[PDB]
Design an enzyme around this catalytic site. Structure first.
Site, PDB file in Angstrom:
ATOM      1  N   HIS A  40      41.482  43.790  35.840  1.00 49.42           N
ATOM      2  CA  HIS A  40      40.886  44.578  37.071  1.00 49.42           C
ATOM      3  C   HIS A  40      41.118  46.094  37.050  1.00 49.42           C
ATOM      4  CE1 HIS A  40      41.697  40.780  38.711  1.00 49.42           C
ATOM      5  NE2 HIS A  40      43.108  40.660  38.185  1.00 49.42           N
TER       6      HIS A  40
HETATM    7 CL    CL Z   1      44.267  38.325  38.372  1.00 50.26          CL
END
Ligand code: CL
Ligand code: CL
Ligand code: CL
Ligand code: CL
Ligand code: CL
Ligand code: MG
Ligand code: MG
Ligand code: MG
Lengths: 215, 215, 215
Positions: free
Chosen positions: B88
């Protein structure tokens, strides 16, 4: 255990540890944490299943007990931390609990009791909250979800987060009237009659009913 | 795994991951969370059982390791977040980890290492605390229960809540003393000889022992 | 179940509750908490398994729904509190949910809807975070691990701890650009072509592509 989250297990009927004192109607609704109140919510308390024998031999002596009043609502995952400091002492050079088996004599027992954890009446404890050892929670207090309580909680106080006090539910005067009448101590029929007032904010109505019918 | 909550699994005995390095006598007392240290406490660390056959393939790059010193006390539910950002990327347009099979060869891998999370010696980590990737914890530090540690912790400091630094356990001079004598690296018999000072606050007595016996 | 922490179950293909709406590609990665998205993450929402028989009877009428957008990343332990106040009313004299069976008919139901919990698109919710009832989360927002969200979250903002707003991911004008182009709604082909741009911080290139090919 729990077949649904609409379930609320009465505590005084179920708990068996001689060191958990519960009041009437108080419940633990722990469906999303599976286990019962004594093996998931009350932690490190001598006198349980995994610890029963050790408690019956009387090796450790007197313990800090958990006292919960009546009409308390304990939500899923709420945790009552007992056993005090569990042998760790920050004022000592080491916080490691050395054992006499591995380190011989001279090992001073760092454990020290923190006092009984006392929860008042009509207390709402949010889900996955955690109470520190030796904390008093006053009557009518509200503990938010995921809250960590380190200090005493004033009666009818609302505490969020890491012991952040939001507000009091009512004016100080009315709070003291509620603390004097103690509706939770009334006979059942009186509570049944005044349930309409209890499902309201009209404190002085309840006081008038108290003076006229109860006290 | 755990039969009681007064039980403490020695960590350097029972940890199989080559990306974990734990010192002597360091234990994890995780009764109220059932599973072992490598199964519950350490999370997203490549090399555990569920990812073994995938990690032995060498398709992933080098990952951050977990190193813990000696005489550490890790309470139940403590957690060591690994795998860094796990792909992320907050600085990218999307934080979603798109898969190459679904969205084509134009997928750029967003994972980035955070650095090894290193825990010092004589470190007490409270119950259900969570340490974020890349965090170093100094010797003699105390992490409060349910604390979330996102920055590096100074030696012999006490951190509670969301990395709120409460205090330091001793004066900075005496902490320098403890940092240069390093009682955790001593031979075992010297520790057994100095046990009663270690269960005290008299640091300079222990330093006189180090001066006259250890070197 | 979950074989490893590297896999995330596609929510749209799996969710059975009619009171839950979820967009495409949004996944739940919940290996370190074992059970599915609908038994562990979504809590106290009628229509799931243990309350299905209660929901089919229409006993409690309409209820708050959970709405999740597209391309959302939900880590293990992220919990969505539903059922509003669960009958607990801080404004009333007692927070105790009295039952009409045990007490008089003068029991008044204190339940109150909190509104639908709405999560936008491209939302990354960290592990073991808790979303209180009625919370709206904007597109592109990031929720930190073990954060407790009690208010609404602005689009493309980073919230950690107890509703502590850290910052926003990009400049306000670029956030507006993303909010108008809405790449998550594009045909999957255009998303595939744009993959090199989405895996970057180049909002301007994405806007140029949208102007040239999509809009
Ligand atoms: Cl995740
Ligand atoms: Cl409840
Ligand atoms: Cl002890
Ligand atoms: Cl009574
Ligand atoms: Cl401990
Ligand atoms: Mg009235
Ligand atoms: Mg001395
Ligand atoms: Mg570019």
């Amino acid at each position: 255990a729990f077949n649904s989250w609409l379930e609320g297990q009465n505590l005084k009927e179920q708990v068996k540890n001689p060191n958990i004192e519960v009041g009437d109607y108080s419940y633990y609704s722990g469906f999303y944490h599976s286990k019962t109140f004594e093996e998931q919510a009350v932690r490190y308390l001598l006198g349980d299943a995994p610890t029963q024998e050790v408690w019956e031999s009387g090796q450790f002596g007197e313990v800090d007990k958990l006292r919960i009043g009546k009409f308390c609502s304990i939500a899923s995952g709420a945790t009552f931390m007992m056993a005090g400091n569990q042998g760790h002492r920050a004022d000592w050079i080491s916080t490691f609990p050395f054992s006499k088996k591995e380190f011989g004599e001279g090992v001073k027992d760092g454990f020290q009791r923190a006092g009984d954890t006392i929860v008042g009446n009509d207390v709402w404890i949010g889900s996955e909250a955690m109470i520190m050892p030796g904390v008093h929670i006053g009557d009518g207090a509200i503990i938010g979800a995921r809250a960590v309580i380190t200090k005493n909680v004033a009666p009818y106080s609302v505490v969020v987060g890491n012991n952040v006090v939001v507000k009091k539910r009512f004016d100080e005067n009315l709070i003291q009237t509620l603390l004097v009448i103690k509706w939770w101590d009334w006979p059942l029929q009186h509570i049944k009659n005044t349930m309409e007032i209890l499902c309201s904010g009209h404190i002085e109505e309840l006081e008038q009913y108290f003076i006229k019918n109860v006290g």
